[PDB]
Design an enzyme around this catalytic site. Structure first.
Site, PDB file in Angstrom:
ATOM      1  N   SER A   1       7.849 -25.831 -18.216  1.00 43.23           N
ATOM      2  CA  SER A   1       6.629 -25.407 -17.534  1.00 43.23           C
ATOM      3  C   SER A   1       6.298 -26.415 -16.440  1.00 43.23           C
ATOM      4  CB  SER A   1       5.479 -25.229 -18.534  1.00 43.23           C
ATOM      5  OG  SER A   1       4.434 -24.464 -17.955  1.00 43.23           O
TER       6      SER A   1
ATOM      7  N   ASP B   1       8.438 -13.791 -17.481  1.00 43.44           N
ATOM      8  CA  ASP B   1       7.451 -14.853 -17.404  1.00 43.44           C
ATOM      9  C   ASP B   1       6.309 -14.451 -16.476  1.00 43.44           C
ATOM     10  OD1 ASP B   1       6.128 -17.335 -17.188  1.00 43.44           O
ATOM     11  OD2 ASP B   1       8.012 -18.465 -17.041  1.00 43.44           O
TER      12      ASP B   1
ATOM     13  N   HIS C   1       7.294 -16.968 -21.131  1.00 44.31           N
ATOM     14  CA  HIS C   1       7.271 -18.325 -20.603  1.00 44.31           C
ATOM     15  C   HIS C   1       7.804 -19.335 -21.609  1.00 44.31           C
ATOM     16  CE1 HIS C   1       6.034 -21.493 -17.940  1.00 44.31           C
ATOM     17  NE2 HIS C   1       5.111 -21.960 -18.765  1.00 44.31           N
TER      18      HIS C   1
END
Ligand SMILES: [Ca+2]
Ligand SMILES: [Ca+2]
Length: 266
Positions: free
Chosen positions: A131, A177, A209
């Site tokens: 991330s 995502d 994600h």
């Protein structure tokens, strides 16, 4: 040199763990400046091995990247997973967090009393990051300090900082995502890296994600390709090239898109 272990196979890489038993060292947030974590190190091994930092980067994540710790360490690496909820946040702070985590491992490596004293070869360092931790990973790759990078569903504000990355970089993108949409993040980040660099783009089919974090529906892919990436580039172990350069990756159900610059190590 640097090679360790037996000739690899797909089943060897997709097994729930690698061959080496793994011990752990808990690191308090009071020490290191990186939010605390857990060092995973193999037992029974001889010689030095590469070290890898695994960093999260999703404030109020529902889960983290811990799977990579025991998984990667069990194939012959010293692997530190960083805890969540550390006060770090955006990709620039995450690059600092990675650098502090790497310093800490090298510092303990240089200690005579660490349970993994002298186990790390300081010239062989990798980073796996999720991330905004993945944006941080690509930023540290651009700083020139590391020898292999695996951003997982990376998030960052711009791709221009990554236009000169020479660090071998495997980006796991997550097809579905919505936190870091592939078209705005993992894809342009991958394309920003020069085609002269050893790199790869693995979009995982239908992935949220969290798809690169492991301990999930993608274990086979993350283990087979991710461990191979680190063996090939950190150990210069050509025996793992077979899993990265050769296969028709997109033929796999779990892999919705593949891109890469094979051959590597030219
Ligand atoms: Ca799909
Ligand atoms: Ca090439």
């Amino acid at each position: 040199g640097f090679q360790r272990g037996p000739d690899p196979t797909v089943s060897f890489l997709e097994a729930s763990s690698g061959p080496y038993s793994v011990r752990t060292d808990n690191v308090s947030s009071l020490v290191g400046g990186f939010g605390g974590g857990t060092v995973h190190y193999p037992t029974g091994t001889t010689g030095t091995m590469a070290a890898v930092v695994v960093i999260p980067g999703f404030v109020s994540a529902e889960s983290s990247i811990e799977w990579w710790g025991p998984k990667l360490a069990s194939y012959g690496f010293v692997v530190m997973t960083i805890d969540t909820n550390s006060g770090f946040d955006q990709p620039p702070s995450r690059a600092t967090q990675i650098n502090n985590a790497l310093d800490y491992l090298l510092e303990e490596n240089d200690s005579s009393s660490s349970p993994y004293s002298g186990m790390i070869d300081p010239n062989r360092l990798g980073v796996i990051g999720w991330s905004m931790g993945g944006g941080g990973t690509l930023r540290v790759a651009a700083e020139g300090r590391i020898q292999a990078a695996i951003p997982l569903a990376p998030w960052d504000t711009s791709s221009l900082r990554f236009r000169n990355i020479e660090t071998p970089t495997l980006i796991f993108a997550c097809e579905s995502d919505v936190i870091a949409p592939v078209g705005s993040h993992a894809d342009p980040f991958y394309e920003a890296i020069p085609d002269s660099t050893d790199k790869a783009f693995f979009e995982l089919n239908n992935g949220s994600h969290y798809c690169g974090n492991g301990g999930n529906s993608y274990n086979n892919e993350l283990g087979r390709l991710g461990v191979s990436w680190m063996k090939l580039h950190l150990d210069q172990d050509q025996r793992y090239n077979q899993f990265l350069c050769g296969p028709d990756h997109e033929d796999e159900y779990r892999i919705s898109e593949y891109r890469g610059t094979c051959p590597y190590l030219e």
